[PDB]
Every structure is written in C-alpha cells, then in structure tokens.
C-alpha cells in the first residue's frame, strides 16, 4: 500500500499476491500506465488495480476508468478499495458493471492445463482470414483471392433480370405498385429496390481485399442509398446491370472501420441508374493500407405516418435477395457476435420503407420516384412493429424530395434518411 | 428581478436530454456523457455533434468528460449565445408542440409582467420546457399560457426567484 509502478514484473512471476497502487493519484495517468504494463507481461496473466475510496476525487475518477477497461479486454480481475467497506448501492453497482472476482466454421483448439485461469481459447492468429471463407462462400461463386486493394476498382459479372425472379420478390416485399403488378398486355418495369437485389453480389465484396479487413461477425449494414440518372427511364426485366466502386480515403471510424460503396446500373451498354451502400465493422485500426447548393424548406409539411410490421421468418425473404450475412438465419452464428437477437437484414428492412413512401405520396408510381436513401441507425429485430414517417424536404428542379423516419417500439430511431420523388 | 443568464450549465443538459429521451431530473450532473447515453453507436455520435454546435468550443474528449466538467468549462467561453442548432430547436417547439398565438415575442413579454424576467431569463425558461415537453400538443391560446406559469416555479430552483 505504498508502491504503484512496482507491480509490472511481480504479478507476472506466477500469481498476484498483494499488488496495490498507493502512488498513482492521477485520473488519466493511472489508466495509461496500466495498459502498458499488461503488454510487457505474459499473455494470459491477471492484473487488478485497487481504487482509493478515501478521497472523493480519486473514487469518482477511478470508477469511470474501471468501467471502460472491463469492456475493452483488460486483465483486471480483483479490486479491493480501502477506507473500509462501501455503501449498500456503491458495492452492488460495481459487481454488475465490472466482472471481478471478490474484494476484502471451425471450433477446435489444443487444450493445455498450464495457464491458470482459462485452459485454451481462440487465438487471434489469422482470425480475419479464416473467418472470411464462410462469408465469401455464401455469395461469391469463385476462389478466395486477397490480392485486391482500396485504391483500385473491379467489376464482377452481369446477371440479366428475369420474369421468374421478379414475381417471387413482389410477394415477399409487399408492394402493389405499377412495377410489381401482374397484368397481361402491359410492359412492367422494375422497382427502385428490385435491381439492387441482383447487383448486391458485386457490392458485398468489400472485405475481399487483404487491406480492408476487420470483424466479420460485427460487419453489419450501415446505410444504403439509391439515385437515378438525369433523364433516364426505369429498367425492365431483360437488361443486366454492373457495379464498380471502391474507397478513396481511409474508411475508418472511432470505434472500428467503415465502408464506402456506390453501385451503378447499366441498360444495354449505357447507364441506367446508381446506388449506394455502407457497412460498419468494429475493431481498432488506424492504418490506411462548390458552395451551398442544397434545397431547403419553409415549414414542416408532413405526408403520412402509418405503421408497418417486420417479417417473423426471414428464410424466404433472404433467399430471393442473396444476402451474404449468415448470422441472421440460424441461432448458432448469432451467439458469437453478441447481438440482441436475430435482427433483419440491412437491405431487406430498408426496402419496405422505400416502397411504402411512393404509395402514400405518388399513389404507388415508380415514374416519379428517382432517388431512395435510407440510413439504418440501429438494428430492427424480427416480428416487431415499425412506425414509419414522412416529411417534405426540398425541391430539385420540379422533383420535391420526401424524408423518412422509421422508429422502433420504444420510440427509438433505428432507421432514417430521405428519398427523392416527383 | 435578478434574471438568470443563459449559462452553459443548464443549456447543455437540456439539449442532451431532448436527443436521448430524458428530463432534467434524470440527467444528473455527476454522470458522464458516455455513461448516460446507454452505449449505442448512433446515440454517441449525435450527442457529440449537438454539444459542439450549441457551445462552439470543441474539446478533446467530449464523451469521456463528465456532465459537471464539460458544462463548467464551456461557460467561460460562451457569453449567452443563441447557437446555430439550439435556435432552430426552440423555434420549432413553439409551432409544433404549441398552438398559433404564442411565439417567441409573446413568451418573453409574459415573464416580465408575471414574474419579472427580461431577455436573459426568457431563454432559460423556454429551454427547460422543450426538453420535458409532453406528447400532447396545444391547440389554443389558453393551453400555451398555462405552461408559462408552471415553468416559472419548476425552474426556479436553478435560478433562485419567486413568483
């Protein structure tokens, strides 16, 4: 109860006996010194700094630093504060927010009873390369080659739209517009989200490169947008499309990595329309390897605010779209990601809000709608209510945009964005 | 009489409670910015952008700082500014959550004759009612006038004035 920085080598010689810190009186200084001492010790040891409950400034700053270290993966397993015992609510809150002891694909590993706490765990050696084989085999029908980079762009193959694939997608999405109608002697085109389902195989190859890696279990869909070309009609059922995009800057974030995708659409050689996609992958990496012209508004003019319902069984909806996310089907793959449950897909849940916006504004007409952007903030679980909303945004040379807002059950923003119609 | 100015200790707590669905009593000053958000990725990014646009001075760690440390450090740099994002949220509540007839000029003039508050305490009374506004909106002039009388007594604990 006098030394502080002398436990850098005493706890790594077998077991931690009476390792305390009575000289570390700094708030942010004590948290940075504890992380550097764990890297110089053995891999698989236990540490544990004791807080000072005698001072009010040390007890308040030490309680906030202990909560952030437990969620990142530290070796702190014991914390015995001084100045006697705490209160009835102070001691009970530390055991629920921090996992301490007391106070006062493939799944095979070689077991070895010589560490102490755990026998054998999953090693981090080639963790991103081994887990990428299960995600690339559920969409891409070729060999695994990590020779790509973010500075270059390459397009895949081309699949033409058929009448058999468009008929099964209309009953699973639930849209009775002019494009998803069944009538004889009438040319039926495709919707705004119909062409993005066939072209999603080439835009989901963002983790195919060796430099754009990350956590594959937490790589969920961040956002997805779409926009038509200037003066172009909608594609029917007979023409193919192509998509080719990359990441210019370092697509990263403060809690992981990001992904910048912008697919396109072809129509017999010439361009048809465009699209956009975004993915949020957790992790910790920092290596990379004119004026105001927007529209405004005068008052909040609302359109409609109806309610919807998510699908309880996503087995027939994900099969017609070709989603590469296999953690939203079976319950075995969802346990490794530590999520709240079997949530819906990013491109499947956003297609219901985009198709319902034209039915309450344009009376279900695909000739006036040109752009559709929906950014999913949170995740929506299956078999739940979805409160939709719409509001007037701005005009774009005769095309008045419409906003969108999808709330959860507890009035939580899970998805938002704004579309473009006329 | 002694009108309280638009300090950063009460303006920052009311703006963060409206985006996270909370009130002034639930958002304590001893908590942190990241501990009171819940831990969501979408709620953490929106809380950092709303605090810097309403204050101006952007610090190093806006989420790791506590509520009593971030609001006290921004009070010395702010001189009662209306803000870019704070002015748009206060004007929209007078038209959506309230009825037609009680604008920003009618709400500030009522506090000088029924409570004795000038332009300094007029912004603090309207900011406390927007963070704890109910789901039922007003539809007449009598509903908006009743909320101004109740706000002078509930928000008097942070200013120190009588009726």
Numbering used by the authors:
A (entry chain G): 601 to 704, 1236 to 1420, 1526 to 1658
B (entry chain A): 140 to 302
Sentences from the study reporting this entry:
Iterative refinement with D3 symmetry applied resulted in a 4.4 Å resolution map of the mutant FAS with improved density for ACP at the stalled DH site. We used the cryoEM density of the truncated model at 15 Å as the initial reference for 3D classification, which was limited to five 3D classes. This resulted in one class with strong ACP density for the shuttling domain that represented ~35% of the symmetry-expanded particle images. Local refinement demonstrated a global resolution of 5.8 Å. The quality of the ACP density was sufficient to allow confident fitting of six out of eight α-helices of the ACP including all four α-helices of the catalytic lobe. Therefore, the observed ACP position is in range for catalysis by the DH domain. The N and C termini of ACP face away from the reaction cavity of the DH domain. This model indicates that both the structural and the canonical lobes of ACP form transient contacts with the chamber scaffold with primarily polar and charged residues lining the interface. Further focused 3D classification in Relion 3.0 on this occupied class demonstrated the conformational heterogeneity of ACP docked at the stalled DH site representing a wobbling motion of the ACP between the ER and the DH domains.
Enzymes responsible for synthesis of the lipid precursor palmitate, a 16-carbon chain hydrocarbon molecule, are collectively known as fatty acid synthases (FAS) and are conserved from bacteria to humans. On the other hand, type I FAS, found in actinobacteria and eukaryotes, is an ‘associated system’ where all essential enzymes are expressed by one or two genes and organized into a large, multi-functional assembly line. Substrate and reaction intermediates are shuttled between catalytic centers via a flexibly tethered acyl carrier protein (ACP) domain. In fungi, one or two genes encode all the essential catalytic domains and additional segments that serve as structural domains, stabilizing the assembly into a barrel shaped D3 symmetric dodecamer of ~2.6 megadalton in size.
